[PDB]
Design a protein around this ligand. Sequence first.
Ligand SMILES: Nc1ncnc2c1ncn2[C@@H]1O[C@H](COP(=O)(O)OP(=O)(O)OP(=O)(O)O)[C@@H](O)[C@H]1O
Ligand SMILES: [Mn+2]
Ligand SMILES: [Mn+2]
Length: 271
Amino acid sequence: MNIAELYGKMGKHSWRIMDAIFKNLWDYEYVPLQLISSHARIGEEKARNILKYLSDLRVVQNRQKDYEGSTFTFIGLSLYSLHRLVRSGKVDAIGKLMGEGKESAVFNCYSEKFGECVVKFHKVGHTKVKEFSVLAIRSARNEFRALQKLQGLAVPKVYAWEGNAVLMELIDAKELYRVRVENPDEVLDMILEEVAKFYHRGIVHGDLSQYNVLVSEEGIWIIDFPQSVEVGEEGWREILERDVRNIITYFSRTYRTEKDINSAIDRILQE
Ligand SMILES: Nc1ncnc2c1ncn2[C@@H]1O[C@H](COP(=O)(O)OP(=O)(O)OP(=O)(O)O)[C@@H](O)[C@H]1O
Ligand SMILES: [Mn+2]
Ligand SMILES: [Mn+2]
């Protein structure tokens, strides 16, 4: 279904059931029916009926293998997170899907307070044994905190975070990947200067690339922070080096810009 239509099918008991799942995600991936029922203050038979219908609408996934338990689907977690944004008065209407990939779905929306914005719903974690709701939620929260810390720099203004959703400014600009520039050396230098300012604020982007820089005749913006780290966190320096190396390499291949990677890293790091 489309997200606005899905929202309109939800009654107050539906939201209560979703609240109950959300508040127990830290303890269980599949929240047991008994806990959903007791938290929602809804009888178990009724609770089960609501969860069946929510599964039919692709909002929850129910499993029975070891016990009767439920969790959100991506659609469901996004819907619930949207509901939190609406209830907090930060969003008035969800609008059209802007784009969706393996990592997120980004929707247009309108806010009386914030104007025409975007809400980005996080699909995946961006995190130990090296071999999903709490991880998508952690991605959203980390992105929100990074954007807060960087306010006043060339990033979107950030407005709210709930669940897997981050509400922020719509940037009218396209990915660098898609835009041929005639002053590539200047554009690269502006990106590197922004990286330096992030670092001064104690933030490393962690996925700097041609897909995460937006450009217009007006300037550049940098987006996409769920994988960001604080300076001091394990591997932060190598992660920063990678950001600098990757963006320089992009410019090297695309424009044959000559920029020394080691010097660029050292300049950033010294002050
Ligand atoms: N504030 C915004 N303004 C305009 N377009 C945006 C904005 N945020 C995201 N987009 C568009 O949506 C696309 C996907 O967003 P983004 O790169 O932030 O996340 P992602 O890589 O899909 O997922 P994740 O959050 O897990 O990294 C962007 O490449 C961009 O084109
Ligand atoms: Mn991205
Ligand atoms: Mn990403």
